[PDB]
Amino acid sequence: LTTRIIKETEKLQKECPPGITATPTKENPRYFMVTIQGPPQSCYEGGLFRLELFLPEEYPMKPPKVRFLTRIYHPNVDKVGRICLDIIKDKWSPALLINKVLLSIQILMSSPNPDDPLANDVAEHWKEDEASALQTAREWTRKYAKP
Amino acid sequence: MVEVPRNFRLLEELETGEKGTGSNQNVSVGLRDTADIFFHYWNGTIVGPPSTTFEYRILSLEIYCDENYPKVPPHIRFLSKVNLPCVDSDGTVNREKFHVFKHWDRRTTMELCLSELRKEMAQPQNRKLVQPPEGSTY
């Protein structure tokens, strides 16, 4: 529990971006349960999405680890919730904070990147027939992300 | 005089951090790389002081203690973007403008350097400098 982590924890409890919650576990204060509301007007609107985030030993040299738990139909999220997002991959800087990671995932839910280099079938659907993809995403939101 | 060798000075500072009770929670320093036994790089944190345009920002710094530390000052760079006179446009803490560095005393520790950068933010002259958006980096 470095000073940094303690101050970040406070900012996450008190000043989480609107639509987001993040709360450390009692057994493990480096391990956070996270929620993000499906963005209004998006295909995820109305849903409540649960994620888990962990600060590994080498944080902040290395980024937080973070995945969805709630199933979500999204070009940049795989079938076990792993997230293709540049800032928790190759565009991480030690100055960035958890707050920013979570905001970025919230933005990624409104603004998917189906042209991300690494091919997957959901991205391919988004490109082939965006309207159908969005429709499947709404169906998945109703099925899996009910508040 | 009796010069403390660099490696034993840095072991001293390592232990001060380790023995730290957790009281001072507005400045922090700690080893960057878990396996460097020669302690070249340190991570620094400053929490921007209250009633300033820096307030409560979690500001990150990198500290390099080269061959000649602490005979010459540590190299301190802000990773978080700041508007502060002693900080150059690449985030480097300027050796002629930061009072602690201009008149360098061996005895000054990395933790004191950070407390002293934090006071720089609270000064009447600097406490109103317009800052970049919170979270900005160089």
Residue numbers in the entry:
A (entry chain AAA): 2 to 148
B (entry chain BBB): 1 to 138
Give verbatim excerpts from the published study on this entry.
We show that, amongst others, the E2 ubiquitin-conjugating enzyme UBC2 and the ubiquitin E2 variant UEV1 are essential for the promastigote to amastigote transition and subsequently characterise these proteins in biochemical and structural detail. We demonstrate that UBC2 and UEV1 form a heterodimer capable of carrying out ubiquitination and that the structural basis for this activity is conserved between Leishmania, Saccharomyces cerevisiae and humans. Therefore, L. mexicana UBC2 and UEV1 readily associate to form a heterodimeric UBC2-UEV1 complex. The UBC2-UEV1 heterodimer, like its S. cerevisiae and human orthologues, is able to form K63-linked ubiquitin chains in vitro, suggesting a role for non-degradative ubiquitin modifications in Leishmania differentiation.
Crystals, which appeared after two days from polyethylene glycol (PEG)-containing solutions, were sent for data collection at the Diamond Light Source, with the best crystal yielding a dataset extending to 1.7 Å spacing. Like its S. cerevisiae and human orthologues, UBC2 has a canonical E2 structure comprising a 4-stranded antiparallel β-sheet flanked by four α-helices. UEV1 exhibits a similar topology, but its polypeptide chain is shorter and the prominent pair of α-helices at the C-terminus of UBC2 (α3 and α4) are missing from UEV1. Superposing UBC2 with human UBE2N, UEV1 with human UBE2V2 or the UBC2-UEV1 and UBE2N-UBE2V2 heterodimers gives RMSDs of 0.82, 1.15 and 1.13 Å for 147, 135 and 271 equivalent atoms respectively, demonstrating a high level of structural conservation between these orthologues. The conserved active site residues, His75, Pro76, Asn77 and Cys85, reside on an extended segment of the polypeptide that connects strand β4 and helix α2 of UBC2, with the thiol group of Cys85 projecting out of the catalytic cleft. The interface between UBC2 and UEV1 involves the β2, β3 and β4 strands and the loops following β1, β3 and β4 of UBC2 and the N-terminus, α1 helix and loop following β1 of UEV1. The buried surface area of this interface is 1,466 Å2. The core of the interface contains a number of hydrophobic residues (Tyr32, Phe55, Leu70 and Val81 of UBC2 and Pro5, Phe8, Leu11, Leu14 and Phe39 of UEV1) that contribute strongly to the interaction. Hydrophobic residues are highly conserved at these positions, highlighting the importance of the associated hydrophobic interactions for complex formation. These hydrophobic interactions are complemented by a number of polar intermolecular interactions, mostly notably between the side chains of Glu53 of UBC2 and Asn7 of UEV1 and Arg68 of UBC2 and the main chain carbonyl oxygen of Ile37 of UEV1. Notably, a salt bridge is formed between Arg83 of UBC2 and Glu18 of UEV1.
